[PDB]
Design a protein around this ligand. Structure first.
Ligand SMILES: CCCCCCCCCCCCCCCCCC(=O)OC[C@H](COP(=O)([O-])OCC(O)COP(=O)([O-])OC[C@@H](COC(=O)CCCCCCCCCCCCCCCCC)OC(=O)CCCCCCCCCCCCCCCCC)OC(=O)CCCCCCCCCCCCCCCCC
Ligand SMILES: CCCCCCCCCCCCCCCCCC(=O)OC[C@H](COP(=O)(O)OCCN)OC(=O)CCCCCCCCCCCCCCCCC
Ligand SMILES: CCCCCCCCCCCCCCCCCC(=O)OC[C@H](COP(=O)(O)OCCN)OC(=O)CCCCCCCCCCCCCCCCC
Ligand SMILES: CCCCCCCCCCCCCCCCCC(=O)OC[C@H](COP(=O)(O)OCCN)OC(=O)CCCCCCCCCCCCCCCCC
Ligand SMILES: CCCCCCCCCCCCCCCCCC(=O)OC[C@H](COP(=O)(O)OCCN)OC(=O)CCCCCCCCCCCCCCCCC
Ligand SMILES: CCCCCCCCCCCCCCCCCC(=O)OC[C@H](COP(=O)(O)OCCN)OC(=O)CCCCCCCCCCCCCCCCC
Ligand SMILES: CCCCCCCCCCC[C@H](O)CC(=O)SCCNC(=O)CCNC(=O)[C@H](O)C(C)(C)COP(=O)(O)O
Ligand SMILES: [Zn+2]
Lengths: 121, 167, 177, 111, 61, 87, 276, 67, 91, 69, 126
């Protein structure tokens, strides 16, 4: 439905996917701390994680992969490890959704504030 | 193989760390392969090599003395130039298997380092251009009638440029 | 495939051959048997009426508008049987229908086995050469009186004679070897 | 682990074995449909051995069996890769093939 | 009829090709911002030059 | 797969079907009994008969030769001749 | 390729809806499924595309040999029109056919389900052509439809086969392989998905309509197909709509591009390049 | 006639094995679908709940106080 | 229509002959007068192994393998090192 | 191979009968129905419902599930 | 609508008016053509079904076809317009088209190589 808003009713309010952080992080965020990668650039390189899979969840992945090589004959027992990885990622998709919504709203700020300044003069 | 002409990196292997009661279906099989496939073969092979070592013979590698190169070779003297177009057509190949090795040494370095080839394997690819930029600069424009006189000219057309550009 | 093609077609055979193309192209739209056995006895009705039209002109005006009604109300993928021209098995087994004049170049070793087979084959080949004369003569003595010739061939008409030109309708590759 | 390399080379040799049996006079004497069906069956089992290896360790192998021409700079050689795509597919394909040859014996009976 | 065929086939082709264009104009994309890769968008690992450090690309919480 | 036909099993099926056609009396159908001169059926009913047979035996009688499957027997040798049944 | 894979998916699927040849319908389904496989490669999701290749092999192989069983058991009838009620006459193949049919329609917890819905939701979540996204999903509903077409006409209907019946599927050579692949069709998606190396970093987070879209569209695809098929038996004649033709004769690409090209490519050689 | 004899206009007789093998393959299909559904019901539901993007306090996203 | 009385005899007679031809085609008794995995699994295997462990293995870059995977906290057999355990997962 | 008595077949009791009755209102009567009777006559007489095929073996399948569970 | 025969997808036999023609003449040709074919048919059928024959049935109708198509062409050639204009567009037309297709490419390539832009990387062969 986001699309319906962007393609059917409005054009500016809805942000463009190509440029999601249209705004600097400081806005409405004093000293926001940046994401921290747990895994070592080397740890990944030694676990031969596909570049794409080197996400901020790379660390829970390496765990899964560990418990998948170990526990070899049993491919149905590294189940907790998969939930974790997935969660980490769900908890990342949500972030990527929070960032998109924040942009959206911020661009709206611009519009409403445009009118604010657009106050008759 | 010369560990140095065909290098090969040292091996690092994670140690066995089973965490399951079940029995690995691989370890058992190997224990068999090693007895019913390897031992039988191993026995034969040795017996081969002792048959060889009885009448051990040797073969050397023809070393070609270096003759005078076209750069120095009278004009029209078909004798000297013939001995000097061969000396080059010979090095047109020795300078080609070298490039065969870099074609190969690399191929291995991207099978041995998958998902890291982008990075770990850049010792070679830097060389595959350090060697390709040269092979391109001494043997490429030439026709199928490649001759030392033409490499002499392909170079010397450009030695002007490394002298006209410089000037 | 057996009988010979008539020169021109009558009115009847054109009408009665639509009753086939039509009813058979009605079992491709109406697949279930019941719907068919219904929607088809209703078809005959269409042909049943306008059966006794004596006015040829009219009759050939019902036929020419029937075959256009049909062309536009036909099924693209009708039900054509498996082994009939245009079918799914048409000429499938023809890769195994060798023409029987090829057992004549077999090595005396091959024909050594299968012994009684060739003992009966040599009888039939004696039959074929023993009548070519009486046949061709028949074919000719009974020739047309300088008139229209069809592709029909005469029967025997005398004992001992074999139907004229019978070597390839008989002794023909078996359909599904 | 030669067990891996040999297995990848072996499937090809085992499957080629039915092809040359028909080249020699031997196939008339044994049953070709039954013999071929069995060897694909054994090929599937042989394919399984590398598949477990890959899964246990997730490692690949480039196998350069024979050189065909140097052709100067572009050397040409016969190489079989054993990446996840190749061995996973090799096992799935032979299982389907093992299924079909037995189906083939029933379907083309009387051919 | 043959004409009916040629027109219909190509009509289909065109409508499709066109609709695919209407599509590229108006794509379907979920409400998700861009994916964030660690380090400098994996500058070094994407094979970047080890010596020349890239303009840091940082990702905040 | 299925067993091959016989000149008396290709005759019992042909009489069977016809005995199930309501117009053709089931007690006056005899193999040497013509469809249009002896049983009474019309021309349109010959097409319908043949078609039943084409569906009982699963093949198509060419019209040019189907236009003549009159006797209820011609159908029994033509079907058999087309299917190579030498009994 | 995302675009052309998408066009082939529906183009082939729509053609399959009206085809009346059992082998032909399965073949069109082979092309559609690969159209979906082409779509995932087009959306740069290579690992899952390979996963569908393996799962696709098990069930499509089953359905064909299933029809191999029906065609051989019947007097070589290759048309759904004359084949009916195989479910009671031959339960062994009918059981194998529906197992394969549901796998083709991505029934939950069967081999198609482990790989196919990953591909579906991948589409529903990526940035893509709107036309491609809509066609791929209805292509999925059509896969259920033609899947429904096969079992209703081939299996659940009064028999319409020729009157003498001689059906035998007891031969070990029929059952065994069909039995063996059926075991693969039931358990392969379970085994392959867990065993393969983690890859692609899928997006399991979706609004529920998109998470369950593959399941629902497949369900109503059959639902809609069921009703239409039933309506057919109502002593109410229903002829073709204008499109039915563009559907049954393969979109008319065969009728037109196979008669013009081979004609204007050979005419030019004999008449112009050779003789002139 | 070999194996099972043909049946003219009658329901082909069926062998014990034909029916049992057919019910066997189908029943295992259903046992597997039911077993996995119970043990792993994340085929329809999904084990991650979509966040409502429209309930994020403006503080959460850095939406400055307008002005 | 109906067969012509002289075509229901050329089909009468020729069918009679076809029936005899097909009888003659029938073969008389005697007509045809005629006058273990180790085999392909083990024997082929030894050879292959002989080839892979004594030609390929011996020659350079003939059997190359992706590096083995090493995770945090797992030991390297050849060198003896123990891969450092990773930074603790806080959540 | 004998053949079932032709008499056995009858149109009543099958869907052909309802087709028979309507065609009859129209005055028409199809004569080939009886031939098309064995389709609906016996063995194949029972109507087959779509849930029945999809759910074949579900009864034991669930019985098996419960036990394993 | 009405079927519309095109040079392809021709008018079927039915739907064809002339089929519905029963003028005396037509039924005189239609019966005069079977004769030619019956006559030819009974000249193939008692020469192919002839015992005691080894020679090759010739099918002279095929020999008249090949001669007409590869050895009766130049004896029936008269150079007109629509034949020489069309006999030069076919031999020199594309042959001149591709020359300006290959010259322009080869010239573009050469310029770029001369000016130093063409990369020619990792190309060590040609
Ligand atoms: C070594 C390197 C070889 C490289 C080859 C590269 C090109 C590809 C060749 C593929 C050959 C495939 C094949 O099996 O050929 C027969 C095969 C046809 O077999 P067929 O039609 O069943 O045979 C019917 C004949 O009437 C025969 O029926 P039959 O019942 O009498 O059968 C007995 C058998 C008798 O077998 C032989 O002919 C043996 C020939 C070698 C001499 C005998 C051994 C001598 C050993 C001396 C030491 O005859 C044959 O089947 C083969 C006849 C022709 C053989 C010619 C030599 C082929 C060598 C292929 C290697 O050819 C093909 O149709 C496939 C060709 C295309 C292959 C594509 C894939 C290529 C992949 C590479
Ligand atoms: C020559 C110019 C053109 C002349 C055309 C007409 C010539 C007719 C008269 C001569 C015909 C025979 C000679 C020409 C063909 C020669 C084929 C040949 O020499 O095969 C070479 C092959 C070894 O191949 P090689 O190139 O040494 O290995 C590549 C390593 N990178 O050696 C082999 O092992 C071949 C084996 C083939 C299979 C033989 C049977 C199996 C047992 C051996 C394996
Ligand atoms: C009671 C609970 C029963 C639960 C269901 C059955 C066991 C489920 C866990 C094992 C995985 C599912 C399975 O049964 O796998 C069978 C499958 C057979 O192979 P196939 O399907 O042909 O695939 C070939 C692909 N190359 O691939 C396999 O063979 C994997 C075998 C693993 C062990 C399966 C044991 C099944 C019988 C005991 C069940 C308990
Ligand atoms: C095509 C096969 C190419 C690779 C094999 C080439 C040699 C084939 C042969 O004729 O056997 C001779 C071989 C002794 O020679 P070889 O071991 O090849 O050493 C010379 C080159 N270094 O005899 C031996 O010592 C090896 C005996 C075992 C051979 C096992 C089967 C061949 C191994 C390569 C199979 C490649 C399969 C490709 C399938 C496609
Ligand atoms: C430059 C290329 C040709 C450009 C002109 C092409 C059209 C020429 C039109 C000529 C019209 C008159 C004519 O018939 O042709 C001239 C000559 C035959 O002339 P004549 O037999 O007297 O016919 C009199 C007709 N009023 O017959 C001729 O001389 C024809 C001259 C052109 C023939 C071009 C054939 C090129 C074949 C290339 C094949 C490559 C492969
Ligand atoms: C069925 C499927 C068959 C597929 C066959 C594929 C064959 C591809 C051949 C490509 C050859 C050229 C490759 C590079 C083309 C290119 O994009 O860049 C170079 C091209 C040079 O063009 P140039 O004439 O020098 O002038 C333009 C200067 N900027 O600069 C340009 O871009 C100019 C425009 C080039 C357009 C080339 C289109 C070629 C299409 C070939 C297939 C379709 C035609 C088939 C034959 C039709 C005629 C019979
Ligand atoms: C599905 C496609 C629908 C197409 C239906 C198509 O229009 C058929 C239809 O109902 S409309 C024509 C009905 N039928 C006639 O138009 C024949 C009239 N022809 C005569 O009446 C002759 O004079 C004759 C006496 C020879 C007939 O006698 P008979 O054929 O031997 O029995
Ligand atoms: Zn069979």
């Amino acid at each position: 439905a986001h699309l319906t808003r962007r393609y059917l009713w409005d054009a500016s309010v809805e942000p463009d996917p190509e440029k999601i952080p249209s705004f600097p992080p400081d806005l409405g965020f004093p000293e926001r701390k940046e994401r921290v990668m747990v895994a070592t650039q080397q740890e990944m390189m030694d676990a031969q994680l596909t570049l794409q899979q080197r996400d901020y969840c790379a660390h829970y992945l390496i765990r899964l992969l560990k418990c998948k090589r170990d526990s070899f004959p049993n491919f149905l027992a590294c189940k907790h490890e998969q939930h974790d990885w997935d969660y980490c990622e769900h908890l990342d998709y949500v972030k990527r959704m929070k960032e998109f919504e924040r942009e959206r709203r911020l661009l709206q700020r611009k519009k409403r504030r445009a009118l604010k300044e657009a106050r008759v003069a | 193989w010369d560990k140095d002409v065909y290098p090969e990196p040292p091996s690092r292997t994670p140690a066995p760390s089973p965490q399951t009661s079940l029995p690995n279906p691989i370890t058992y099989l190997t224990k068999a392969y090693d007895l019913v496939v390897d031992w039988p073969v191993t026995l034969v092979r040795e017996f081969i090599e002792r048959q060889h070592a009885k009448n051990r013979t040797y073969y050397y590698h023809r070393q070609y003395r270096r003759v005078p190169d076209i750069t120095e070779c009278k004009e029209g003297d078909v004798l000297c130039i013939y001995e000097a177009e061969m000396q080059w057509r010979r090095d047109f190949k020795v300078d080609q298997e070298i490039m065969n090795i870099i074609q190969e040494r690399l191929k291995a370095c991207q099978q041995r380092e998958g998902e890291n080839y982008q990075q770990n394997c850049a010792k070679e690819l830097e060389q595959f251009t350090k060697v390709t930029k040269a092979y391109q600069d001494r043997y490429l424009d030439l026709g199928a009638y490649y001759s030392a006189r033409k490499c002499l000219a392909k170079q010397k057309q450009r030695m002007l440029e490394e002298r006209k550009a410089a000037r | 495939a057996f009988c010979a093609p008539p020169a021109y077609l009558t009115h009847q055979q054109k009408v009665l051959r639509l009753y086939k193309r039509a009813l058979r192209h009605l079992e491709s739209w109406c697949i279930h048997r019941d719907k068919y056995r219904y929607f088809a006895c209703l078809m005959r009705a269409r042909f049943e009426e306008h059966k006794n039209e004596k006015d040829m002109m009219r009759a050939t005006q019902l036929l020419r508008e029937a075959e256009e009604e049909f062309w536009q109300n036909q099924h693209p993928q009708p039900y054509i049987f498996p082994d009939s021209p245009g079918g799914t098995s048409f000429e499938r087994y023809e890769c195994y229908k060798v023409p029987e004049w090829c057992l004549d170049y077999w090595h005396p070793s091959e024909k050594a086995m299968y012994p009684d087979y060739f003992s009966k084959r040599e009888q039939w080949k004696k039959l074929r050469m023993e009548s070519w004369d009486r046949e061709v003569k028949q074919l000719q003595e009974e020739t047309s009186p300088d008139g229209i010739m069809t592709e029909a061939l005469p029967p025997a008409r005398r004992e001992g004679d074999l139907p004229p030109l019978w070597w390839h309708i008989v002794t023909r590759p078996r359909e599904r070897p | 682990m030669n067990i891996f390399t040999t297995s990848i080379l072996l499937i090809f040799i085992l499957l080629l074995s039915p092809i040359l049996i028909s080249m020699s006079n031997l196939i008339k004497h044994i049953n070709f449909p039954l013999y071929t069906t069995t060897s694909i069956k054994f090929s599937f089992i042989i394919s399984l051995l590398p598949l477990l290896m890959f899964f246990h360790n997730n490692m690949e192998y480039m196998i350069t069996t024979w050189h065909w021409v140097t052709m100067n700079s572009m050397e040409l050689k016969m190489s079989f890769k054993t990446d996840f795509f190749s061995i996973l597919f090799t096992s799935v394909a032979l299982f389907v093939t093992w299924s079909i040859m037995q189906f083939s014996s029933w379907y083309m009976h009387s051919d | 009829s043959w004409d009916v065929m040629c027109k219909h086939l190509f009509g289909f082709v065109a409508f499709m090709v066109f609709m695919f264009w209407v599509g590229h104009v108006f794509p379907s994309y979920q409400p998700v911002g861009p994916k964030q890769y660690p380090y400098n968008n994996l500058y070094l690992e994407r094979g970047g030059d080890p010596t020349k450090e890239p303009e840091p690309v940082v990702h905040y919480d | 797969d299925a067993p091959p036909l016989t000149l008396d099993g290709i005759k019992d099926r042909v009489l069977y079907v016809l005995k199930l056609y309501d117009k053709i009396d089931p007690e006056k159908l005899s193999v040497n009994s013509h469809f249009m001169k002896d049983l009474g059926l019309d021309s349109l009913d010959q097409v319908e008969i043949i078609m039943a047979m084409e569906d009982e035996f699963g093949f198509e009688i060419p019209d040019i030769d189907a236009e003549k499957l009159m006797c209820p027997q011609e159908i029994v040798d033509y079907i058999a001749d087309k299917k190579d049944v030498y009994e | 390729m995302l675009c052309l894979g998408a066009l082939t998916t529906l183009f082939t699927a729509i053609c399959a809806l009206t085809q009346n040849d059992i082998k032909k319908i399965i073949a069109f389904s082979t092309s559609s499924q690969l159209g979906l496989m082409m779509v995932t490669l087009g959306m740069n999701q290579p690992h899952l595309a390979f996963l569908h290749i393996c799962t696709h092999a098990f069930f499509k192989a089953m359905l064909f040999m299933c029809s191999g069983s029906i065609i051989h058991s019947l007097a070589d009838e290759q048309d759904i029109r004359k084949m009916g009620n195989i479910t009671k006459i031959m339960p062994f193949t009918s059981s194998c056919l529906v197992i394969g049919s549901l796998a083709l329609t991505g029934m939950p917890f069967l081999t198609g389900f482990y790989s196919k819905d990953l591909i579906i939701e991948a589409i529903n979540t990526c940035n893509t052509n709107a036309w491609a996204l809509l066609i791929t999903l209805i292509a999925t509903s059509m896969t259920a439809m033609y899947s429904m077409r096969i079992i209703y006409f081939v299996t659940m209907t009064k028999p319409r086969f020729p009157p003498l019946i001689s059906i035998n599927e007891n031969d070990p050579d029929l059952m065994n392989p069909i039995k063996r692949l059926a075991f693969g069709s039931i358990f392969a998606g379970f085994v392959i998905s867990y065993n393969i190396p983690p890859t692609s970093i899928p997006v399991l987070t979706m609004p529920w309509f998109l998470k369950t879209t593959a399941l629902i569209i497949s369900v109503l695809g059959f639902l809609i197909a069921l009703e239409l098929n039933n309506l057919t038996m109502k002593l109410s004649m229903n002829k073709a709509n204008p499109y039915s033709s563009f559907s049954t004769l393969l979109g008319f690409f065969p009728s037109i591009i196979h008669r013009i090209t081979p004609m204007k490519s050979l005419n030019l050689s004999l008449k112009t390049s050779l003789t002139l | 006639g070999v194996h099972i004899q043909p049946r003219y206009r009658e329901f082909p007789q069926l062998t014990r094995s034909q029916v049992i093998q057919g019910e066997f393959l189908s029943s295992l299909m259903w046992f597997w679908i039911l077993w996995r559904f119970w043990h792993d019901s994340d085929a329809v539901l999904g084990h991650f709940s979509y966040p409502d993007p429209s309930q994020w306090t403006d503080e959460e996203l850095g939406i400055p106080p307008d002005d | 229509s109906g067969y012509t009385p002289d075509e229901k005899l050329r089909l009468q007679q020729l069918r009679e002959l076809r029936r005899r031809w097909l009888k003659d085609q029938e073969l008389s008794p005697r007509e045809p007068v005629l006058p273990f995995a180790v085999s392909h699994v083990l024997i082929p295997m030894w050879f292959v192994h002989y080839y892979v462990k004594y030609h390929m293995a011996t020659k350079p870059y003939t059997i190359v393998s992706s590096k083995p995977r090493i995770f945090p906290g797992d030991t390297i057999l050849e060198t003896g090192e123990v891969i450092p355990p990773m930074r603790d997962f806080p959540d | 191979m004998e053949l079932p008595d032709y008499r056995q077949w009858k149109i009543e009791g099958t869907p052909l009968e309802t087709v028979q009755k309507k065609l009859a209102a129209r005055g028409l009567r199809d004569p080939w129905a009886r031939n098309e009777a064995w389709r609906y006559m016996g063995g194949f007489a029972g109507n087959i419902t779509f849930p029945s095929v999809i759910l074949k073996g579900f009864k034991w399948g669930f019985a098996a599930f419960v036990v394993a569970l | 609508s009405k079927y519309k025969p095109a040079p392809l997808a021709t008018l079927p036999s039915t739907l064809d008016p002339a089929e519905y023609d029963v003028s005396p003449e037509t039924r005189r040709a239609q019966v005069e053509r079977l004769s030619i074919r019956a006559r030819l048919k009974r000249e193939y059928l008692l020469q192919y079904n002839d015992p005691k024959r080894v020679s090759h049935i010739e099918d002279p109708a095929l020999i008249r076809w090949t001669y007409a198509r590869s050895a009766n062409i130049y004896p029936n050639f008269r150079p007109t317009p629509k034949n020489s204009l069309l006999g030069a567009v076919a031999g020199f037309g594309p042959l001149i088209f591709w020359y300006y297709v290959f010259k322009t490419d080869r010239d573009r390539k050469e310029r770029l190589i001369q000016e130093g832009k063409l990369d020619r990387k990792f190309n060590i062969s040609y």
